[PDB]
Symmetry: D2
Amino acid sequence: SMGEIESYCNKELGPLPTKAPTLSKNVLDLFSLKGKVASVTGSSGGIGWAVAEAYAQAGADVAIWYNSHPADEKAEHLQKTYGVRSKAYKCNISDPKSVEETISQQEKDFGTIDVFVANAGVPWTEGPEINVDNYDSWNKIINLDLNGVYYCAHTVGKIFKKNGKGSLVITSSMSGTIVNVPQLQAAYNAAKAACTHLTKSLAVEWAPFARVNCVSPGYIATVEKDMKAKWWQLTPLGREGLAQELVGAYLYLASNASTYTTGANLAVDGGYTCP
Amino acid sequence: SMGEIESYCNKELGPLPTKAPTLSKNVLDLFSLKGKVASVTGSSGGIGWAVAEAYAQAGADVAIWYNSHPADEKAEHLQKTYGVRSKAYKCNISDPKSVEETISQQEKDFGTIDVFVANAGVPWTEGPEINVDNYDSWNKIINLDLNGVYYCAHTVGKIFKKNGKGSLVITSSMSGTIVNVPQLQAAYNAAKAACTHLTKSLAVEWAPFARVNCVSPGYIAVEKDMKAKWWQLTPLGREGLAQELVGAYLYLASNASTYTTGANLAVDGGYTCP
Amino acid sequence: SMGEIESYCNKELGPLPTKAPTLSKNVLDLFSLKGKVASVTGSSGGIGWAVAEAYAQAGADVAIWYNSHPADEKAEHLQKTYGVRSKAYKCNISDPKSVEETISQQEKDFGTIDVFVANAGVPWTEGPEINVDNYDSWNKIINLDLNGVYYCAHTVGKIFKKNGKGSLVITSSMSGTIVNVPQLQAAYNAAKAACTHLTKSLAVEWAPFARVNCVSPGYIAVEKDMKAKWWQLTPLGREGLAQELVGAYLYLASNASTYTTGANLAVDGGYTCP
Amino acid sequence: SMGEIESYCNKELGPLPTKAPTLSKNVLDLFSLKGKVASVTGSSGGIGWAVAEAYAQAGADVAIWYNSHPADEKAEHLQKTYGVRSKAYKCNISDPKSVEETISQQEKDFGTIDVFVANAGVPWTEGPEINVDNYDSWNKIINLDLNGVYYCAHTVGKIFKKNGKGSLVITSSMSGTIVNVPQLQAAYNAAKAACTHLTKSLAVEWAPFARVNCVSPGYIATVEKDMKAKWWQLTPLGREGLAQELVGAYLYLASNASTYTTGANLAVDGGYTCP
Ligand SMILES: NC(=O)C1=CN([C@@H]2O[C@H](COP(=O)(O)OP(=O)(O)OC[C@H]3O[C@@H](n4cnc5c(N)ncnc54)[C@H](OP(=O)(O)O)[C@@H]3O)[C@@H](O)[C@H]2O)C=CC1
Ligand SMILES: NC(=O)C1=CN([C@@H]2O[C@H](COP(=O)(O)OP(=O)(O)OC[C@H]3O[C@@H](n4cnc5c(N)ncnc54)[C@H](OP(=O)(O)O)[C@@H]3O)[C@@H](O)[C@H]2O)C=CC1
Ligand SMILES: NC(=O)C1=CN([C@@H]2O[C@H](COP(=O)(O)OP(=O)(O)OC[C@H]3O[C@@H](n4cnc5c(N)ncnc54)[C@H](OP(=O)(O)O)[C@@H]3O)[C@@H](O)[C@H]2O)C=CC1
Ligand SMILES: NC(=O)C1=CN([C@@H]2O[C@H](COP(=O)(O)OP(=O)(O)OC[C@H]3O[C@@H](n4cnc5c(N)ncnc54)[C@H](OP(=O)(O)O)[C@@H]3O)[C@@H](O)[C@H]2O)C=CC1
């Protein structure tokens, strides 16, 4: 190692400095996903479907994931409307083994995976933890909202490493930064904070071959009146967000617009984390 | 409902504002634990034993936890030296059922639990996760360093609510705030970040009856050249000692911190600042 | 008052909930700045010129600011190459009165201001503050890197409120989140942290009519061995380029981020994670 | 430098590792300030007076600071009640020169300064900044709540460096971490965030000879009804704090209880930063 500056972070970067990529000089071209393959978990639901069609509008082939609501006709919609390749995949993400089979199948079907969005999740709906006596709801949150994200990350990182390139986007939540009120959600808040800092941890470990980032959305239209009303009162923009207001953040992170961005948390929460 | 200011955080608080506690006018007496019962998990280990003995020095009865290394001699030493009640308990904290049995037996042996430190944990020692085929290592750390902490918290919070008083201290890590280098520890970093935010979430939920805070230690005193890089990145230029943590745990456990809840206390030699 | 949900953050918002904006259904059109006027301070410099040209490429009219290095040729180049309106303005932003004169003249020359980037700044280059007898260096950085940013913000916020629309982007620094080493930069770090929190404070105050976000760049490409340590501590292993920032500034300036306010966007190669 | 591990943070630490101090083995003795000299700015007001008498109860000599409310009889109270040496000092902290004269006078009067609390400050009381047209209130906040803290820090650090030991405690605010509502306070929020991160910056620079930390209190009893009521609703403990609830944090940081703690922000806010 004499005559080499080795990294304190990850010596697999090789002799420092690493060199910068080549980038289109037109900013609008940086956001293109033409020729890239995207994989979006939870793209049966509101947020995931939104980023999936946003990625298709950017020119990416898109693998769609579902569990209990088959979304083949969504994949058909992307092919019919944007001319891109798409397909739907069924997978219980709580199961590490199904996740690995699905991602391997996608690699074969599309040839590679350039972008991965780990987005599928479930909420905690049971009020304060102290009145919830068995640990099954806690475990169900940890299993999918944290362990499931890691199974997807661990599996696709080996694809990114083999090819030397990739962008992983994790859907976290403002619940990883703050505590939601009045609906108390300790298990979900803890899983999401794990997700945000797993993002930073994987950004360091994957540095030689991929970028890892995360979006922390606020309340997204996607509920008792008096509760929503307190949400609106505590959010500086004064309203809930729309799923279409998130896709710009996911496309920014997925594309060459963010080649120096890794380990970042993009809060898209109407300012809720500020007060 | 009408004629009452209701909390937006937690309606169990009752009509606002809540009542300030009665505190001694001498700052030194605020740190006393006389008449209080403390339970410290992982107190057969370095940090947990230092905290357990410090609580005994502050006057607390101390319940000692161990798993593989029996700590009954540690319990006798607190009894012999400080004249407090102490007993050691064997428990695998990754087992929920076993956690609930131990805490309940402790309530009966001491009468109550006033201070709880969720401290037992294991590190990640396999390097970059991308080369660990099997998920047992990931799951071993989540179950003990996250699920295990929740098992103790859920269980002792019931005691705190029954008595209307209590202080939970969670041992997190600077690994919950930063990413350690060059030893890559993704699973551990993630579990400790969940611990830190679990601290804040439970502070809100438990606020009518208990405080919840956490301590995030840095490196507390295995290849030379790796430490060398730790020292180079630590503003104070050295690793910490177990005795440099006990003031933090005593502050959070005692009446010195009655307005402090949901806080993360960094004791890391400044490592999180660069 | 009765029959209206009033905000706890800012009653200027009116009865809640507020109305979502109308957005294009194609994600790519959300990033367009066609029909919008952008003002970028410090746009004779590296980062600011890259952002100014990117906004022109997105279709915006661009007002260019300079102090000591005239940038009229930069304004002609945006006009010549992208067919947008552009003019360069001379201003010492540490002078409040001079800031207000420039922004007002810009409103008249372009009709309005839709996007503002507060970007001009100077670094600290004297090493450890303990050896700097005189306070002019501390004051020089506070006045330009903090007070100057506020002078522009206070002034352009009036335009945004009059028009009911606008996006302010503040150039902060990873120095607002961490402490740079080994070059010790206390005054600069403090001013950038104030900038980052000024971003959040103004997002709340301006929420009825404008968004306020900030970008925190890392090292963007002076002794070899110091960079060497920068590279060793940066997860990506290299310094950034100015072109790797423009996507962040375009995202925050455009309709792509209509639910994003008070956010700090780190573009630092991961430096804030270790 | 061959044969020496030099710090990446501050090479004035000398060859690494630095060694740990010697510490009493009884935790209660770590909190003692016997034989130490403390200097507390803003100790005419609520918070500063509280930590001053707490420091005196710990056995420290205490220099008391005032500007418009002479507090000599407070210094007399500390001497008469605790047998400690105390004195009052008049100083406009916005003026860098008066600050340096006062601290030099205290060094001569007491012999040294072991602990410094930079606590004096003023609030912003003028609502949203956009309706405040001259910059004088902004400047008055920056001048005292940020520049004044630095003048005190810069001056006492040279005392700490000369003697190789010291503890600086800065009174920040939860306003350095969050945005206060409904009373809008941009200038104060910005000054306080500067204070919190100046703490971290000085912790790195002063590492070879002092520790630097900061306390961020919430709302402390020390105001229109409807406004306070919204504060109470947003604070998890459900009430404002008392000044006596802060002194434990200041004594922890000032004493040998925290010899491995530097660059830390201790939030004492009833949990307000969590929701
Ligand atoms: N404050 C908050 O609560 C915040 C929430 N989020 C998070 O954003 C993510 C997406 O949320 P959103 O689209 O709005 O919610 P939706 O319920 O609308 O969609 C959830 C998706 O997860 C999928 N999924 C559910 N369970 C499983 C399972 N075992 N295995 C595999 N996939 C599963 C569902 O698929 P299917 O329907 O086919 O079963 C669905 O596509 C979530 O992770 C959410 O937690 C982010 C912002 C803030
Ligand atoms: N030392 C350091 O540098 C750092 C430590 N920490 C954390 O502080 C805590 C203790 O650390 P430390 O004292 O240094 O390490 P030690 O190994 O010395 O102590 C570990 C303790 O955890 C107990 N324990 C381990 N596994 C289990 C299990 N299944 N069930 C119940 N108890 C178990 C051990 O009990 P037994 O030995 O009897 O089996 C032991 O008492 C941990 O949370 C650690 O992650 C955080 C930051 C830095
Ligand atoms: N490059 C980096 O690594 C980092 C930069 N930043 C910040 O990004 C901003 C610009 O940085 P960068 O482009 O790299 O440096 P440059 O020196 O290249 O650009 C500085 C710009 O600020 C302008 N300016 C300087 N002083 C004044 C003044 N009194 N009044 C008005 N304008 C003034 C300069 O104008 P002129 O030349 O005409 O006098 C110039 O356009 C700054 O806020 C910087 O602190 C943040 C993190 C890292
Ligand atoms: N959310 C919030 O707003 C928070 C506020 N804080 C901060 O805690 C600190 C102390 O607050 P607190 O005691 O409660 O307020 P007080 O008004 O009661 O006391 C303020 C003290 O500052 C001194 N002082 C005022 N102006 C000057 C000046 N030019 N020069 C020198 N000294 C001056 C005053 O001295 P004299 O009376 O003799 O003129 C007084 O002793 C403050 O910095 C406050 O900003 C911390 C927690 C949260």
